[PDB]
Amino acid sequence: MKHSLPDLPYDYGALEPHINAQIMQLHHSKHHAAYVNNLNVTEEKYQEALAKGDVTAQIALQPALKFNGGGHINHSIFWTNLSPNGGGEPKGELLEAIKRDFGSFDKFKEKLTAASVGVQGSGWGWLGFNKERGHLQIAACPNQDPLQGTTGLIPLLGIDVFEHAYYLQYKNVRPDYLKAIWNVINWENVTERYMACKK
Amino acid sequence: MKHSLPDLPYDYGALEPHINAQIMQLHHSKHHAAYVNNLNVTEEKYQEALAKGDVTAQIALQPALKFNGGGHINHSIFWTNLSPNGGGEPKGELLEAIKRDFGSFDKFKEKLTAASVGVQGSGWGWLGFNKERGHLQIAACPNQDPLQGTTGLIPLLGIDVFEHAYYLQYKNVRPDYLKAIWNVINWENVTERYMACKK
Numbered sequence: 343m344k345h346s347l348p349d350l351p352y353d354y355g356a357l358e359p360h361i362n363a364q365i366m367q368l369h370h371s372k373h374h375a376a377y378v379n380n381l382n383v384t385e386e387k388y389q390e391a392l393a394k395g396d397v398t399a400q401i402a403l404q405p406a407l408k409f410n411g412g413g414h415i416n417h418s419i420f421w422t423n424l425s426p427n428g429g430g431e432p433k434g435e436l437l438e439a440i441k442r443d444f445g446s447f448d449k450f451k452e453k454l455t456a457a458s459v460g461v462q463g464s465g466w467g468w469l470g471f472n473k474e475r476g477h478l479q480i481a482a483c484p485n486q487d488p489l490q491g492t493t494g495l496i497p498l499l500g501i502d503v504f505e506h507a508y509y510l511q512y513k514n515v516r517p518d519y520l521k522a523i524w525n526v527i528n529w530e531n532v533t534e535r536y537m538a539c540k541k
Numbered sequence: 542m543k544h545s546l547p548d549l550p551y552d553y554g555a556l557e558p559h560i561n562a563q564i565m566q567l568h569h570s571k572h573h574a575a576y577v578n579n580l581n582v583t584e585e586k587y588q589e590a591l592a593k594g595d596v597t598a599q600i601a602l603q604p605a606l607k608f609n610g611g612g613h614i615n616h617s618i619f620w621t622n623l624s625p626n627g628g629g630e631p632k633g634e635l636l637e638a639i640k641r642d643f644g645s646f647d648k649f650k651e652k653l654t655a656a657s658v659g660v661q662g663s664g665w666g667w668l669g670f671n672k673e674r675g676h677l678q679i680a681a682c683p684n685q686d687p688l689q690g691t692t693g694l695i696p697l698l699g700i701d702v703f704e705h706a707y708y709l710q711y712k713n714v715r716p717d718y719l720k721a722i723w724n725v726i727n728w729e730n731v732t733e734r735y736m737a738c739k740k
């Protein structure tokens with residue numbers, strides 16, 4: 343059992359005009375494919391170092407593991423966080439939590455947008471669920487650093503603000519990308535991750 | 542596998558008055574012991590995570606692996622870098638390399654002292670060997686981050702400037718600790734590590 347690049351659950355052009363087909367095809371078939379492959383390479387090196395007790399080699403592999411492992415985690419969620427059937431607002435308990443914790447849906451959007459635009463360099467913005475605190479929480483992550491691995495928060499919605507996620511279409515204007523992406527958020531999927539946290 | 546705490550090459554008081562017996566006993570039997578015990582626990586969690594393909598857990602474990610793994614790496618070297626028979630200046634090729642790259646033994650001491658005193662918070666000062674350039678190099682690392690694992694340099698001489706390495710004796714006056722430790726440097730051991738990675 344090794345990790346595999348999951349197929350996109352929709353056509354490359356399904357998110358147009360918000361994210362064009364060239365970005366989606368490169369993002370999935372080039373960037374994510376590389377993370378999975380590099381992740382499997384790093385895991386194998388880590389297994390040999392562990393069997394040998396080479397702690398130096400284990401630590402030397404950590405950046406590659408976090409970057410490519412994080413890449414696999416984050417992009418697997420990202421594809422499910424988007425959909426041609428997306429957009430609009432969530433319903434039910436997720437919507438109520440958003441209003442309770444952030445005041446309103448629109449207030450939440452400004453905060454997550456500000457966190458995503460506020461990333462200097464490469465990184466991710468996340469809406470997560472804090473199991474210990476029992477409420478929602480917004481965080482930004484550097485590079486491919488994944489939310490749960492580095493913060494314990496359970497990822498609900500991630501926004502890739504790597505330049506490869508938008509540059510071909512929006513060039514330097516990251517805020518235009520952020521404006522458009524709200525129209526394709528698959529709140530059905532985001533609701534599923536939230537409801538799975540509560541029991 | 543199972544890493545183990547290496548026996549000290551001398552008794553806890555052999556480095557007095559420069560490093561007192563209480564520090565040595567605590568440093569080896571408590572601090573280093575904890576790195577080994579915590580390293581083994583973290584490594585076991587890694588094997589399970591690798592067997593399960595739980596990348597989040599692997600990444601969540603990285604800080605504990607680097608801190609305790611690095612702790613194990615650094616302190617195992619540190620003990621061999623010190624000796625009751627130590628002090629003075631090195632001889633032969635090691636001494637020649639120091640004069641060439643740092644001007645003189647005394648200038649080398651000033652630079653490594655400054656790098657060690659300059660660490661803000663916890664960390665280590667290292668004299669290392671750069672295999673690609675074929676010469677000596679001084680660098681500082683934060684916390685237990687090990688020299689080779691994070692820089693590729695081969696460790697020759699390390700100076701622990703964690704507060705537990707001197708505080709009981711020297712309190713806040715780290716420069717007195719740095720000055721004193723030169724008296725017990727095991728240049729025979731430093732030469733062995735250097736010659737192993739040098740003609």
Ligand SMILES: [Mn+2]
Pocket residue numbers: 369373417502504506507
């Ligand atoms: Mn990406």
Ligand SMILES: [Mn+2]
Pocket residue numbers: 568572616701703705706
């Ligand atoms: Mn120490």
